[PDB]
Design a protein around this ligand. Structure first.
Ligand SMILES: Nc1nc2c(ncn2[C@@H]2O[C@@H]3COP(=O)(O)O[C@H]4[C@@H](O)[C@H](n5cnc6c(=O)[nH]c(N)nc65)O[C@@H]4COP(=O)(O)O[C@H]3[C@H]2O)c(=O)[nH]1
Ligand SMILES: Nc1nc2c(ncn2[C@@H]2O[C@@H]3COP(=O)(O)O[C@H]4[C@@H](O)[C@H](n5cnc6c(=O)[nH]c(N)nc65)O[C@@H]4COP(=O)(O)O[C@H]3[C@H]2O)c(=O)[nH]1
Ligand SMILES: Nc1ncnc2c1ncn2[C@@H]1O[C@@H]2COP(=O)(O)O[C@H]2[C@H]1O
Ligand SMILES: Nc1ncnc2c1ncn2[C@@H]1O[C@@H]2COP(=O)(O)O[C@H]2[C@H]1O
Ligand SMILES: [Ca+2]
Ligand SMILES: [Ca+2]
Ligand SMILES: [Ca+2]
Ligand SMILES: [Ca+2]
Lengths: 376, 376
């Protein structure tokens, strides 16, 4: 059953028959018609390239019309199994759109959790608009001397409904929605604003070197990065706040590498302009081993998930050792994440990790408390 | 946040621009056209049903007017939201939408080709399977020190009567992401196990008992066929059917299998408890494996072709290979280097610590007959 030839005047199937399979026309033409009492009623003619017999398969109902070959035709068979396989695995509302169209095309030619997702997106975007969002900052520290060298910017939603939704999942929603670009724009702006403030205070207390080497880490999502005008907008924002590129560090996940072409150059643009590129959640998600060989990275983060089990089992300790040494060999530098105890800080230090981040040192805090932290 | 509209209120009129769609929560509405003075009722829509969607998808005007027949409450659905969901839908599913839309419009008033080609190709492939056009070739895996054959990888081949001996990349993806995995996968495992028994029998009959006892048959098991239930059950009867020991059978997955997690982890442990060797193929290419080495009981891990072919070319990918090999040893995992074409690369991999090898240098994959000759 590949393609099949049928001759002129042959009824392929009749209306009211059971729906076995669909057909795509390769050669010739066919007629779609209804019959009422004695009169036959032509709905349309279908020439090559067009498809028919599909309706019956999707919703498991009978043939809504008859079909007859107006000339010699050649048809390519499409199976019931094939269409169901594709519709069943489709988006939830997309499947509704299909059912209404089917039912309307039939009815006329004769004559919650999906909704909840929509409502939640609106709740989040409305929350954004009423100024319920805020950035906190977590110190990144030099493990040797315990000195603060920078900070990661982290988003916060000040509402009791955030706990009802999920700590992570409101970011997932944001990231997969197209409210990414206006919110992302606000984040970058806010972080850059507070960076200027952090630097200004440091200089006014005769800490010129610490101010010159300070890093502001910003978490940039996949959609907002691969969007055009990203570097353009990012640059006028840096200009607006009078900042240098070496103090701004962009933090992506590995997943950004699966795209390829559209990403490569944007990484290289940021790299040529002087922005530091950091890879977060490394070894968790999309594999970058061979993509770390060719692309230009500055830092790479050993994720919480590894660090918390570093003393627990020796398997994940081996992996951390490996990551750290590999990073050095690649000329990449490392920030260990999720350090909660002095013991794990020591191990990471003897393994060769230079920089640290975790509750041991400091949980993320507001700008006020952060400015106080950098006076000791 | 839904909106109430009173009786007789026109929501929108035909010919208006398409802002957004609506889902009816309470009440009923009428869909109608107007000609000159007379209005023509297409249908009535009650609660649960959706309207105003057509205009948004293909960016055309309102195809009909809508008026509330009673007090109704409507839930708003945005333009952005529908486009976001349809654009990210399956390729043929999007065709099915366009034909239905066009037919519902064209009759109410009265990326195409490569989508169809996918359907035709699946049928071509499955039909080819059914007329016995598939065959397994085997590629020697060799001990790098002594150059002795220690096992083989089973690789699928399509020897079409018109296309000829075509190679698996053009049709394995299709097979793997289709309902035809389970019957074809079953045939592969059976065929490989059948020919394993043969390989062992011939070895013993030539007084090579030790080589027969240590022989490995590598089988490439896809993600869908692994995560399917009855996998270990079917695998086990098949081993019993051919009178084979588990230590001679090695299952070869890609990293992707563990994006699932729970459903996989135990099936790995079942195979591991039963005595099957688990090998990870295409490591560092696809879904990140670093954290997968912490969780899984792995026996072997393959350094992919992609690394090996550039191992002399640039020193960056040589560092990565060194790292992988040492990490593997530290995890108590053993290594098979893949895609060795020159003696020089074989030497480097040997000094780096890789024990086993696979590549054209030694032998390309061949039929069972030629393989049985190779092992003398
Ligand atoms: N248990 C433990 N956790 C520690 C410790 N130290 C830091 N953490 C947590 O580690 C997370 C930062 O890592 P991430 O991979 O950027 O993980 C972030 C990041 O993926 C995303 N995110 C946060 N802010 C932004 C943002 O502004 N833009 C985007 N696109 N994503 C953001 O949300 C994720 C979670 O953010 P948070 O809940 O703030 O969680 C933070 C922080 O609270 C520790 O010592 N112990
Ligand atoms: N150029 C070059 N190539 C070398 C060399 N040494 C080995 N190869 C190639 O490496 C491929 C096997 O690696 P794979 O990652 O399992 O790659 C396989 C595997 O992912 C998939 N595949 C093949 N057979 C099966 C199967 O029976 N079941 C499943 N699930 N997948 C299969 O198809 C992929 C390609 O298979 P093949 O075309 O047979 O290609 C083979 C083999 O021809 C070399 O020295 N030079
Ligand atoms: N109004 C129409 N205009 C064009 N084709 C139609 C129309 N109605 C039905 N068809 C096609 O005719 C086929 C009859 O069999 P099905 O109902 O399975 O699938 C139907 C559609 O593919
Ligand atoms: N024939 C029909 N049967 C039921 N609803 C229809 C029909 N034609 C159009 N509609 C609906 O009326 C809406 C008018 O605006 P749209 O064309 O955007 O989307 C249209 C459909 O949602
Ligand atoms: Ca981060
Ligand atoms: Ca992280
Ligand atoms: Ca393989
Ligand atoms: Ca491989």
């Amino acid at each position: 059953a590949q393609s099949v030839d049928i001759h002129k005047d042959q009824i392929i199937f009749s209306e009211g028959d059971a729906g076995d399979c669909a057909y795509i026309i390769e050669k010739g033409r066919v007629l779609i018609y209804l019959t009422k009492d004695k009169e036959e009623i032509p709905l349309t003619i279908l020439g090559e390239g067009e498809i028919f017999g599909e309706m019956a398969l999707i919703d498991n109902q009978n043939r809504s019309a008859s079909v007859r070959a107006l000339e010699d035709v050649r048809l390519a068979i499409v199976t019931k199994q094939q269409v169901l396989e594709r519709v069943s695995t489709a988006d939830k509302v997309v499947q509704l759109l299909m059912r209404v169209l089917l039912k309307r095309l039939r009815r006329k030619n004769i004559g919650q959790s999906a909704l909840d997702q929509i409502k939640l997106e609106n709740q989040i975007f409305q929350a954004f608009q009423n100024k319920e969002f805020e950035l906190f900052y977590q110190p990144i520290v030099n493990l040797k001397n315990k000195t603060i060298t920078g900070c990661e910017a982290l988003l916060r939603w000040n509402s009791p409904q955030h706990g009802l939704v999920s700590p992570n999942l409101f970011i997932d929603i944001i990231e997969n929605s197209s409210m990414v670009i206006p919110i992302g724009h606000w984040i970058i702006n806010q972080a850059l604003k507070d960076l200027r403030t952090i630097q200004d205070q440091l200089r006014l207390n005769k800490k010129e070197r610490m101010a010159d080497d300070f890093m502001m880490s910003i978490n940039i999502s996949g959609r907002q990065f691969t969007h055009s005008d990203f570097v353009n907008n990012l640059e006028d924002l840096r200009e607006k706040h009078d900042l240098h590129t070496q103090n701004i560090k962009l933090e992506m996940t590995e997943r950004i590498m699966m795209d390829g072409a559209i990403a490569i150059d944007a990484l290289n643009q940021c790299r040529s302009l002087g922005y530091a590129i950091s890879i977060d959640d490394f070894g968790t998600g999309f594999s970058g081993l061979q993509y770390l060989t060719q692309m230009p990275i500055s830092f790479l983060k050993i994720d919480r998930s590894f660090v918390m089990k570093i003393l627990s089992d020796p398997k994940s300790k081996a992996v951390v050792s490996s990551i750290i040494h590999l990073a050095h060999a690649m000329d990449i530098e490392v920030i260990a994440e999720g350090i909660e105890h002095h013991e794990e800080a020591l191990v990471l230090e003897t393994l060769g990790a230079r920089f640290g981040q975790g509750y041991l040192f400091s949980k993320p805090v507001d700008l006020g408390r952060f400015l106080k932290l950098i006076k000791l």
